[PDB]
Amino acid sequence: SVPSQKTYQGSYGFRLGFLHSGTAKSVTCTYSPALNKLFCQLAKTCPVQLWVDSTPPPGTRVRAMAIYKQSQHMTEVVRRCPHHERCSDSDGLAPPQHLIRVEGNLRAEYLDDRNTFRHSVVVPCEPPEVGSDCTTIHYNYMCYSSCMGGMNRRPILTIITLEDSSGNLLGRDSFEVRVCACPGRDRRTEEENLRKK
Ligand SMILES: O=C(O)c1cc(I)c(-n2cc(F)c(F)c2)c(I)c1O
Ligand SMILES: [Zn+2]
Protein backbone atom coordinates (compact mmCIF):
# COMPACT_ATOMS: atom_id res chain seq x y z
CA SER A 1 0.00 0.00 0.00
CA VAL A 2 1.14 3.52 -0.90
CA PRO A 3 -0.61 6.79 0.05
CA SER A 4 -1.48 9.11 -2.81
CA GLN A 5 0.62 12.24 -3.30
CA LYS A 6 -1.60 13.84 -5.97
CA THR A 7 -2.07 17.56 -5.38
CA TYR A 8 -5.78 18.18 -4.88
CA GLN A 9 -7.17 21.58 -3.91
CA GLY A 10 -10.72 20.24 -3.51
CA SER A 11 -13.87 22.23 -2.82
CA TYR A 12 -12.18 24.54 -0.31
CA GLY A 13 -9.17 25.50 -2.46
CA PHE A 14 -6.70 23.95 -0.01
CA ARG A 15 -2.95 24.47 -0.47
CA LEU A 16 0.21 24.96 1.58
CA GLY A 17 2.39 28.03 2.01
CA PHE A 18 5.94 28.52 3.22
CA LEU A 19 7.87 31.44 4.67
CA HIS A 20 10.86 32.99 2.91
CA SER A 21 13.68 32.31 5.35
CA GLY A 22 16.68 32.57 3.01
CA THR A 23 19.79 30.42 2.78
CA ALA A 24 22.18 31.85 5.37
CA LYS A 25 24.44 29.31 7.06
CA SER A 26 22.53 29.94 10.31
CA VAL A 27 19.01 29.25 9.01
CA THR A 28 17.21 26.36 10.73
CA CYS A 29 14.37 25.79 8.24
CA THR A 30 14.09 26.98 4.64
CA TYR A 31 11.82 26.12 1.73
CA SER A 32 12.84 25.89 -1.94
CA PRO A 33 9.98 26.61 -4.36
CA ALA A 34 12.10 25.51 -7.32
CA LEU A 35 12.63 22.07 -5.73
CA ASN A 36 9.34 21.94 -3.75
CA LYS A 37 11.59 20.92 -0.90
CA LEU A 38 11.86 21.91 2.76
CA PHE A 39 15.33 21.80 4.35
CA CYS A 40 15.44 21.78 8.14
CA GLN A 41 17.60 20.98 11.13
CA LEU A 42 16.80 18.11 13.49
CA ALA A 43 13.85 18.78 15.83
CA LYS A 44 13.58 22.48 14.88
CA THR A 45 10.38 24.41 14.21
CA CYS A 46 9.06 24.08 10.64
CA PRO A 47 6.21 26.56 10.00
CA VAL A 48 3.79 25.31 7.35
CA GLN A 49 0.94 27.60 6.29
CA LEU A 50 -2.51 26.31 5.36
CA TRP A 51 -4.49 28.40 2.85
CA VAL A 52 -8.09 27.98 1.66
CA ASP A 53 -10.47 29.85 -0.60
CA SER A 54 -13.48 29.03 1.60
CA THR A 55 -13.96 27.83 5.16
CA PRO A 56 -14.21 24.05 5.69
CA PRO A 57 -16.86 22.64 8.05
CA PRO A 58 -16.38 22.33 11.81
CA GLY A 59 -14.57 19.08 12.51
CA THR A 60 -12.26 19.27 9.50
CA ARG A 61 -8.71 18.10 10.33
CA VAL A 62 -5.23 18.34 8.78
CA ARG A 63 -2.97 15.27 8.75
CA ALA A 64 0.76 14.97 8.03
CA MET A 65 2.46 11.74 6.93
CA ALA A 66 5.90 10.93 5.51
CA ILE A 67 6.61 8.51 2.66
CA TYR A 68 9.80 7.61 0.85
CA LYS A 69 10.08 9.48 -2.45
CA GLN A 70 11.75 6.72 -4.48
CA SER A 71 9.31 4.14 -5.84
CA GLN A 72 11.42 1.17 -4.76
CA HIS A 73 11.12 2.29 -1.11
CA MET A 74 7.62 3.73 -1.09
CA THR A 75 6.03 0.70 0.58
CA GLU A 76 8.42 0.98 3.55
CA VAL A 77 7.07 2.81 6.59
CA VAL A 78 9.04 5.99 7.30
CA ARG A 79 10.04 5.84 10.96
CA ARG A 80 12.70 7.08 13.34
CA CYS A 81 16.00 5.21 13.32
CA PRO A 82 17.09 2.66 15.95
CA HIS A 83 18.95 5.37 17.88
CA HIS A 84 16.38 8.16 17.88
CA GLU A 85 13.41 5.93 18.69
CA ARG A 86 15.24 5.08 21.96
CA CYS A 87 16.57 8.49 23.01
CA SER A 88 13.66 9.31 25.38
CA ASP A 89 13.07 12.76 23.83
CA SER A 90 9.31 12.31 24.22
CA ASP A 91 7.03 15.32 24.45
CA GLY A 92 4.42 13.25 26.30
CA LEU A 93 2.20 12.89 23.22
CA ALA A 94 4.19 11.76 20.18
CA PRO A 95 5.16 8.08 20.15
CA PRO A 96 8.96 7.83 20.14
CA GLN A 97 8.90 6.07 16.73
CA HIS A 98 7.15 8.94 14.88
CA LEU A 99 9.29 11.09 12.60
CA ILE A 100 6.84 14.01 12.37
CA ARG A 101 5.58 15.84 15.44
CA VAL A 102 3.28 18.83 15.79
CA GLU A 103 4.71 21.40 18.17
CA GLY A 104 2.63 23.30 20.72
CA ASN A 105 -0.85 21.88 20.06
CA LEU A 106 -2.37 19.74 22.81
CA ARG A 107 -5.11 18.62 20.38
CA ALA A 108 -2.64 16.82 18.12
CA GLU A 109 -3.35 13.11 17.74
CA TYR A 110 -0.84 10.49 16.63
CA LEU A 111 -1.97 7.50 14.59
CA ASP A 112 -0.32 4.13 14.07
CA ASP A 113 -2.43 2.80 11.21
CA ARG A 114 -3.75 -0.62 12.17
CA ASN A 115 -3.50 -1.93 8.58
CA THR A 116 -0.55 -0.10 6.98
CA PHE A 117 1.46 0.57 10.17
CA ARG A 118 2.21 4.04 8.84
CA HIS A 119 2.51 6.97 11.24
CA SER A 120 0.71 10.27 11.01
CA VAL A 121 -0.14 13.28 13.15
CA VAL A 122 -3.47 15.07 12.78
CA VAL A 123 -4.81 18.32 14.26
CA PRO A 124 -8.23 20.02 14.21
CA CYS A 125 -8.55 22.90 11.78
CA GLU A 126 -8.81 26.28 13.53
CA PRO A 127 -9.42 29.62 11.82
CA PRO A 128 -6.61 32.17 11.57
CA GLU A 129 -6.04 34.53 14.46
CA VAL A 130 -7.61 37.95 13.98
CA GLY A 131 -5.42 39.90 11.57
CA SER A 132 -4.03 36.81 9.83
CA ASP A 133 -5.09 35.32 6.51
CA CYS A 134 -3.85 31.75 7.00
CA THR A 135 -3.28 29.22 9.75
CA THR A 136 0.21 27.93 10.56
CA ILE A 137 1.11 24.49 11.91
CA HIS A 138 4.55 23.99 13.45
CA TYR A 139 6.10 20.62 12.60
CA ASN A 140 9.28 18.99 13.88
CA TYR A 141 11.23 16.25 12.07
CA MET A 142 12.87 13.95 14.60
CA CYS A 143 15.62 12.20 12.59
CA TYR A 144 18.19 13.31 10.04
CA SER A 145 17.75 12.17 6.45
CA SER A 146 21.13 10.44 6.91
CA CYS A 147 20.19 8.43 10.04
CA MET A 148 21.56 4.91 9.73
CA GLY A 149 18.93 2.21 9.98
CA GLY A 150 16.17 4.78 9.48
CA MET A 151 15.83 7.09 6.48
CA ASN A 152 19.46 6.19 5.64
CA ARG A 153 19.99 8.98 3.06
CA ARG A 154 16.71 8.25 1.25
CA PRO A 155 14.62 11.33 0.39
CA ILE A 156 11.14 11.57 1.84
CA LEU A 157 8.09 13.62 1.12
CA THR A 158 5.52 14.92 3.58
CA ILE A 159 1.91 14.58 2.44
CA ILE A 160 -0.53 17.03 4.03
CA THR A 161 -4.18 16.04 3.78
CA LEU A 162 -7.30 18.01 4.64
CA GLU A 163 -9.88 15.53 5.96
CA ASP A 164 -13.48 15.59 7.11
CA SER A 165 -14.49 14.31 10.54
CA SER A 166 -14.61 10.70 9.24
CA GLY A 167 -11.16 10.96 7.68
CA ASN A 168 -12.39 11.29 4.09
CA LEU A 169 -10.19 13.25 1.70
CA LEU A 170 -10.99 16.95 1.13
CA GLY A 171 -7.63 18.24 -0.11
CA ARG A 172 -3.99 17.25 -0.48
CA ASP A 173 -0.59 18.89 -0.96
CA SER A 174 2.97 17.68 -0.48
CA PHE A 175 6.63 18.65 -0.35
CA GLU A 176 9.98 16.90 -0.23
CA VAL A 177 11.94 17.12 3.05
CA ARG A 178 15.65 16.94 3.83
CA VAL A 179 16.57 16.99 7.52
CA CYS A 180 20.20 18.06 7.72
CA ALA A 181 22.79 19.99 9.71
CA CYS A 182 23.04 22.96 7.29
CA PRO A 183 19.72 23.59 5.50
CA GLY A 184 20.89 26.91 4.04
CA ARG A 185 23.95 25.44 2.35
CA ASP A 186 22.12 22.33 1.19
CA ARG A 187 19.32 24.38 -0.35
CA ARG A 188 21.88 26.52 -2.19
CA THR A 189 23.73 23.40 -3.39
CA GLU A 190 20.64 21.59 -4.65
CA GLU A 191 19.25 24.71 -6.33
CA GLU A 192 22.57 25.17 -8.12
CA ASN A 193 22.56 21.52 -9.22
CA LEU A 194 19.04 22.05 -10.60
CA ARG A 195 20.10 25.20 -12.46
CA LYS A 196 23.09 23.44 -14.03
CA LYS A 197 20.95 20.43 -14.99
O1 LIG B 1 -10.61 32.15 6.78
C1 LIG B 1 -11.19 31.23 7.50
O2 LIG B 1 -12.29 31.38 8.02
C2 LIG B 1 -10.42 29.97 7.66
C3 LIG B 1 -10.98 28.93 8.41
C4 LIG B 1 -10.29 27.74 8.58
I1 LIG B 1 -11.24 26.25 9.77
C5 LIG B 1 -9.03 27.61 7.98
N1 LIG B 1 -8.26 26.41 8.05
C6 LIG B 1 -7.52 26.02 9.15
C7 LIG B 1 -6.82 24.91 8.77
F1 LIG B 1 -5.98 24.21 9.54
C8 LIG B 1 -7.14 24.61 7.45
F2 LIG B 1 -6.63 23.59 6.74
C9 LIG B 1 -8.04 25.54 7.01
C10 LIG B 1 -8.40 28.66 7.23
I2 LIG B 1 -6.43 28.55 6.45
C11 LIG B 1 -9.14 29.84 7.06
O3 LIG B 1 -8.63 30.85 6.32
ZN1 LIG C 1 17.67 9.14 13.69
Curated annotation (Swiss-Prot):
Changing residue 1 to C: In a sporadic cancer; somatic mutation. Changing residue 184 to W: In sporadic cancers; somatic mutation. Changing residue 178 to H: In LFS; germline mutation and in sporadic cancers; somatic mutation; abolishes sequence-specific DNA binding; does not induce SNAI1 degradation. Changing residue 43 to S: In LFS; germline mutation. Changing residue 80 to G: In LFS; germline mutation and in sporadic cancers; somatic mutation. Changing residue 197 to N: In sporadic cancers; somatic mutation. Changing residue 174 to T: In a sporadic cancer; somatic mutation. Changing residue 178 to G: In LFS; germline mutation and in sporadic cancers; somatic mutation. Changing residue 188 to G: In sporadic cancers; somatic mutation. Changing residue 78 to A: In sporadic cancers; somatic mutation. Changing residue 77 to I: In sporadic cancers; somatic mutation. Changing residue 80 to S: In sporadic cancers; somatic mutation. Changing residue 67 to S: In sporadic cancers; somatic mutation. Changing residue 126 to D: In sporadic cancers; somatic mutation. Changing residue 150 to L: In sporadic cancers; somatic mutation; requires 2 nucleotide substitutions. Changing residue 138 to Y: In sporadic cancers; somatic mutation. Changing residue 28 to I: In a sporadic cancer; somatic mutation. Changing residue 58 to L: In sporadic cancers; somatic mutation. The modification Phosphothreonine is found at residue 189. Changing residue 28 to N: In a sporadic cancer; somatic mutation. This is Cellular tumor antigen p53. It comes from Homo sapiens (Human). The lineage of its organism: Eukaryota, Metazoa, Chordata, Craniata, Vertebrata. The chain holds residues 96 to 292 of 393 of the full protein.
